[PDB]
Paper text:
We hypothesized that it would be possible to enhance the affinity of HIF-1α for p300 by hybridising key regions of both CITED2 and HIF-1α (see later). A hybrid sequence (CITIF) was designed containing an N-terminal fragment of CITED2 (224–243) and a C-terminal fragment of HIF-1α (792–826) fragment. Expressed and chemically synthesized peptides were tested with both giving a KD slightly lower than the HIF-1α sequences and comparable to the CITED2 sequences. The CITIF sequence exhibited p300 binding enthalpies and entropies intermediate between those observed for HIF-1α and CITED2. We obtained co-crystals of p300 in complex with CITIF and solved the structure at 2 Å resolution (ESI†). Overall, the high B-factors and the poor electron density especially for the loop regions point to the dynamic nature of the complex, which is compensated by the tightly packed crystal lattice with an unusually low solvent content (25.7%) resulting in high resolution. The structure shows that residues corresponding to CITED2 and HIF-1α bind simultaneously, occupying their native binding sites and reproducing most of the native contacts with the protein (ESI†), in line with the thermodynamic signature we observed for CITIF binding. Binding of CITED2 to p300 however is characterized by small favourable enthalpy and entropy changes, yet (in our hands) its affinity for p300 is slightly higher than that of HIF-1α and therefore may also augment the allosteric changes that accompany ternary complex formation between HIF-1α, CITED2 and p300 en route to unidirectional displacement of HIF-1α by CITED2.
The hypoxic response is mediated by transcriptional activation of genes that facilitate either short term (e.g. increased vascular permeability, glucose transport) or long term adaptive mechanisms (such as angiogenesis);5–7 these processes are largely mediated by the transcription factor Hypoxia Inducible factor (HIF) 1.5–7 HIF-1 is responsible for the activation of over 100 genes that play essential roles in the hypoxic response and thus plays a role in tumour growth and survival, making it a potential target for anticancer drug discovery. The CH1 domain (which differs by only a few amino acids between p300 and CREB33,34) interacts with the carboxy terminal transactivation domain (C-TAD) of HIF-1α. Of particular interest, CITED2, is a negative feedback regulator that reduces HIF-1 transcriptional activity by competing for p300/CBP. The CH1 domain of p300/CBP forms a rigid globular structure consisting of four α-helices (referred to here as α1–4), stabilised and constrained by three Zn atoms.
Author numbering:
A (entry chain B): 4 to 58
B (entry chain A): 328 to 420
Write the structure that this text describes.
Amino acid sequence: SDEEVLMSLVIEMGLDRIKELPQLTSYDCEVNAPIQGSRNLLQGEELLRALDQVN
Amino acid sequence: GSADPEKRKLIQQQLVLLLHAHKCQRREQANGEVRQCNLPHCRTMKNVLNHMTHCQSGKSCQVAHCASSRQIISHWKNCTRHDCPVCLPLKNA
Ligand SMILES: [Zn+2]
Ligand SMILES: [Zn+2]
Ligand SMILES: [Zn+2]
């Protein structure tokens, strides 16, 4: 995911426009964004390494 | 539970913002302790990312966007769904 792609998604999704950012709930996230059952809710600095184009 | 299409849109938007902020912050950590990006909520999600690295409250955590961000990130890492209504924009684009 090029930062070029991420900037394009940010602008296509409206995130460059001033907004209220809703505080989603862990529940609404566990429902609409389920972990495998891996049950591996990343913590520590590994949680940042994930974001380095992980598949 | 039951999937709401609107929540899935707020979720993918928070994911794009988390991914931007990380890359933004990586581009900062090499270029000095900058913190110059003025994208809406970018500073916010950078501070969220640094919170949850050293955070240990886990699900008990009420700091805005920590619990949710940690769940969304963990999903995106392992999401191998072809069809995923959250990730499909990012994975494929
Ligand atoms: Zn930024
Ligand atoms: Zn926390
Ligand atoms: Zn997904």
